[PDB]
Design a protein around this ligand. Sequence first.
Ligand SMILES: Cc1cc2nc3c(=O)[nH]c(=O)nc-3n(C[C@H](O)[C@H](O)[C@H](O)COP(=O)(O)OP(=O)(O)OC[C@H]3O[C@@H](n4cnc5c(N)ncnc54)[C@H](O)[C@@H]3O)c2cc1C
Ligand SMILES: Cc1cc2nc3c(=O)[nH]c(=O)nc-3n(C[C@H](O)[C@H](O)[C@H](O)COP(=O)(O)OP(=O)(O)OC[C@H]3O[C@@H](n4cnc5c(N)ncnc54)[C@H](O)[C@@H]3O)c2cc1C
Ligand SMILES: C=C1C(=O)C=Cc2ccccc21
Ligand SMILES: C=C1C(=O)C=Cc2ccccc21
Ligand SMILES: [K+]
Ligand SMILES: [K+]
Lengths: 587, 587
Amino acid sequence: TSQWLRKTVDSAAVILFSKTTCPYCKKVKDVLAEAKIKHATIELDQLSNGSAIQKCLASFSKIETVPQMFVRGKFIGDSQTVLKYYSNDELAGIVNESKYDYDLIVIGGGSGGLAAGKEAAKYGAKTAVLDYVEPTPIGTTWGLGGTCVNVGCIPKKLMHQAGLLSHALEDAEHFGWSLDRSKISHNWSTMVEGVQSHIGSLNWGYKVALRDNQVTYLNAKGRLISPHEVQITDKNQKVSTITGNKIILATGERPKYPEIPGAVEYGITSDDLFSLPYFPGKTLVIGASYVALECAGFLASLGGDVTVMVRSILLRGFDQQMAEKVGDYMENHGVKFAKLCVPDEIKQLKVVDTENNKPGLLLVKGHYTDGKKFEEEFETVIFAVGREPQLSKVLCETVGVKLDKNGRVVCTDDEQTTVSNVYAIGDINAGKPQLTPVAIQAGRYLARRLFAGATELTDYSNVATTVFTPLEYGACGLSEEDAIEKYGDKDIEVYHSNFKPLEWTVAHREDNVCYMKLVCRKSDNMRVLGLHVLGPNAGEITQGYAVAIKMGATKADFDRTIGIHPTCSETFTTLHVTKKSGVSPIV
Amino acid sequence: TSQWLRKTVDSAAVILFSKTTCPYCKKVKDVLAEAKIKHATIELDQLSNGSAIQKCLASFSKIETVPQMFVRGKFIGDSQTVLKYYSNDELAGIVNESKYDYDLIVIGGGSGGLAAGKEAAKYGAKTAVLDYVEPTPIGTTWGLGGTCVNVGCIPKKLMHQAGLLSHALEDAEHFGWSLDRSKISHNWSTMVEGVQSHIGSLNWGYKVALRDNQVTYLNAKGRLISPHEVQITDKNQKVSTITGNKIILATGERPKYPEIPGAVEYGITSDDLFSLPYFPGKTLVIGASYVALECAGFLASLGGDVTVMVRSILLRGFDQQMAEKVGDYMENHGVKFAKLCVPDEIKQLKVVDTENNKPGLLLVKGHYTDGKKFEEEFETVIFAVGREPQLSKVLCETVGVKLDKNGRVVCTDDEQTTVSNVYAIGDINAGKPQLTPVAIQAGRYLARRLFAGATELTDYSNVATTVFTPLEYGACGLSEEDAIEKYGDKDIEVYHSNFKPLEWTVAHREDNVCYMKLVCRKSDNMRVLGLHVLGPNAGEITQGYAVAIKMGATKADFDRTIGIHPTCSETFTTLHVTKKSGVSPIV
Ligand SMILES: Cc1cc2nc3c(=O)[nH]c(=O)nc-3n(C[C@H](O)[C@H](O)[C@H](O)COP(=O)(O)OP(=O)(O)OC[C@H]3O[C@@H](n4cnc5c(N)ncnc54)[C@H](O)[C@@H]3O)c2cc1C
Ligand SMILES: Cc1cc2nc3c(=O)[nH]c(=O)nc-3n(C[C@H](O)[C@H](O)[C@H](O)COP(=O)(O)OP(=O)(O)OC[C@H]3O[C@@H](n4cnc5c(N)ncnc54)[C@H](O)[C@@H]3O)c2cc1C
Ligand SMILES: C=C1C(=O)C=Cc2ccccc21
Ligand SMILES: C=C1C(=O)C=Cc2ccccc21
Ligand SMILES: [K+]
Ligand SMILES: [K+]
């Protein structure tokens, strides 16, 4: 309790201890509101041990009454001392007094960093957010908001949507719409322009949002040179230094290139794909990550000639039964796979036409595991062979922020690095799921612990995911193989079923391709250890179930729940075929 | 325990008490399997009080060992007596010996009745399912499977889908597809033909399914004349009588007509809509149920001129804030509403063209609450002014099955009517949510209690729903107004937010129309009392959350869960604006 309280007092920029039923508190609140002074507030009457807290406060203030106002680790006064400060118009300089230029500097203006920034400023923390987008080899760059906004989830899903509309056009005819499909084509550059216009509205909405929370935004490359000092290089190359109490590292990752001749010069990554000025044309995706398969899938649904070169397996780290079903759907729907194949070199045959927005032309040479040569021409070659942080570009090694062997930041469960005022969130936080909503929740929850005395940690267990392949794949919890490894085969029951979306019946799409399973623990009341679903809208299906699983759902909790009919998701409420039973999951 | 056991013994058609680790049991199992004798099995080693049960069994068998086999309330033997019966080829006549023609007669071959039938036969119950479809006034009729399959959820959602594809065609252009929309039209009869072909495959799949579980299917009108006697009229008018141990009434409801001149002669209901041989054309829907709005919505999205005549409010019994938002979306997207208006008469101006499949033409006369006359021409007039059971057509009043004032069957929480061998499931069970998955779960769970010694009851609390209006509306739990009425305003907190599907950004659809809220109980740890969402795929969104709510989810359980990005459903995991705060839910 006093451990909690001295952390809180030391860390908050401007915090008020208070009670709901306290008119002097309210008059402090109103004076600060009226003064445009943002602050955290702890209502001691709403905590089970507010009494203990009010008492231990005397260790900081020499008093035990509410209101108590602190600034940057130091008691400032009760009601009368605040009004004294206000009426003398000394309050501004009081609440702005700091050893440092800022209470918080965020390095990286992405998902985690913007969320942490905004939330901190809400409680009075003087905040600066730094963001700079180092260009890709071909010079692609973009605005504020990080990987998801600009070159990730947002444009990725929009282009997935454009792909799904392909199949909407096909389905439309069976549902009675008179459509001349022989005279329908897709225009890559019209789609990119719409995608990029929505992104620009996000770049701009984030700038505006920072402005509206009095966050300082610096489009500058940050480098942490000591615990509290960040050296910024601006657009001009002008160098300067700013100081901050807390530092949040939220710099994300960038795509890796394979170390082969031609890769950097002639290939592209997802960084370039989503603003590509020309239709990629006949495309080779090298990789097997969810990024690789997502991109191949939508390019193929847009009518493209698409090949995916796979070294070993699809979606390493995901349930491999589900990965195979993902892959099988894509193969039967236009995506070619060069299985057990690696690339040796990219040779240029045509340069990109900057004039007519046409792709160039490339010769990809590689080899299969069976010794046969791979040699084929593609207009575009995309690498999706993983991503890596670039922290030597951000961290003077002298500061003492410890990195792991992969270059990610080693953190405690409250995101603290080995430099105690420096935290790391998002993709660079070693061992955490690399997902936008995780980074947002981490940054916001961290900001609350730093600046408003919260204690809640981010829960990184059982974080649900969706892969937006042509047929989508959502999961929450363990893969079937990881559950068996953890608990043993004898203790695992798997219930499963195929299903067919009603939307697919009249459209003449496949029976017994969509599929779901619950991976359960026999010895723990058939606890649901992992949920897996392959089918349309798989993220909408999966999300709600993640709440139940977080609460410890069992098979019996699924069974008790009544279905919504007609939906895909309702099939989770009637599963009865187990894998051990050997009975077929088909319907 | 002995109460449970004598119910079980009396009711099961063919049940075996047993243990997993019992070779004589297995040899009984295998002889019966080999004999094609279906039966229930209770493994006493898997119940906490299997010991007490094995003991109390001596009250029925004079023995205390496993295996113990019963038929229709009477001990039949241990291992040796069964093999004795088998080897003498007396076992068939033993397990077929019954006071009654059937162990179970289901009256009504719909959602509940087919599910109860199939599940009962699984455990050896000799089962007959009766179904007959009394024609609509214009002579429409259909095949096996009940209201949902033929004239409800299935064709309703398929035509909703055909409507959604309309908006897919519009969206397609913004996502880059070159589409001449000025030359696209919808063909009603092509859609109906696809819809009806899928229905026929369900009619046929249900027949096949009954055949494969040795259920007898009689396309005959059933009438219960005494507790155990059903009088059947067949296609021919040939009358006969069959007897059954247990009777399940699962006869559903039929559409009501308003008592006004012309309604029966010239209007139609949903019963007729889904196989209508002609495009309805300019249509008037009289009503404000979810059926009324669902039908108006898809007709309008198919290009139709659609008017809905509303007496008072939309969707009485649903959250009225959500109903208004549903209605507002439809008004801004092509549906006209004649508010506070009732019909007085339907006059015919043109007869339906049976030849060219063109609608007729009707004059609808009515009056508004303000005294102004309503008079307008429509090609089709649909009544969706509620539904009612027709039990006098099924129940000789002499049998003693008690009905309520609305003609529905008064039941205990195990679906038992006031005639103890007669149960009621589905829409005719008074006070229960009238939904297909409820009826399926009730029928299956009931069948298990009757014929395999199960005890689990159906849980009718917090049953989630989705209304498939043009913008869909899913709910689970209480409306905001019912929660306030139950607990009082002071004890209710409502968190809410607008949201925008990512799919809508590039498509230029509305900000701040989709919407969700959690209705919570302050004094019970912010327990989620009701969840409400308006937006695409609202049934996929809502379903998973119904499991969490069944488990007692609180706001904190929602907050702890990490979102899947990008999805609509993820917004439930980050809600923070309360209604009391007066802060706007817009984003
Ligand atoms: C193709 C692709 C698709 C994806 N799809 C999804 C999805 O569908 N759902 C999901 O949840 N996640 C998805 N992700 C992951 C998601 O993008 C990341 O989890 C998220 O963007 C990372 O948040 P972050 O804050 O860690 O880093 P980022 O979002 O990458 O932000 C880091 C920012 O800091 C900048 N920066 C780097 N160094 C400096 C420096 N010295 N000074 C100043 N600024 C610097 C970076 O240029 C960047 O702008 C996808 C990723 C990719 C590559
Ligand atoms: C337009 C409409 C849309 C709907 N959409 C949905 C939805 O989207 N999701 C959902 O969950 N629910 C929906 N419903 C409700 C759903 O249809 C019902 O809950 C379900 O069909 C009722 O199941 P049941 O077994 O009670 O009766 P029914 O399905 O109606 O089956 C009763 C059967 O018994 C027959 N019968 C009647 N009398 C006799 C007799 N004497 N002898 C023999 N047979 C007889 C009947 O003709 C019928 O075939 C919808 C209903 C309507 C009208
Ligand atoms: C296992 C696979 C599959 O099923 C389909 C495609 C594929 C491609 C590359 C590697 C493996 C697979
Ligand atoms: C409250 C309504 C609304 O918002 C829109 C349409 C409507 C139609 C009939 C009755 C009420 C409404
Ligand atoms: K269920
Ligand atoms: K959350």
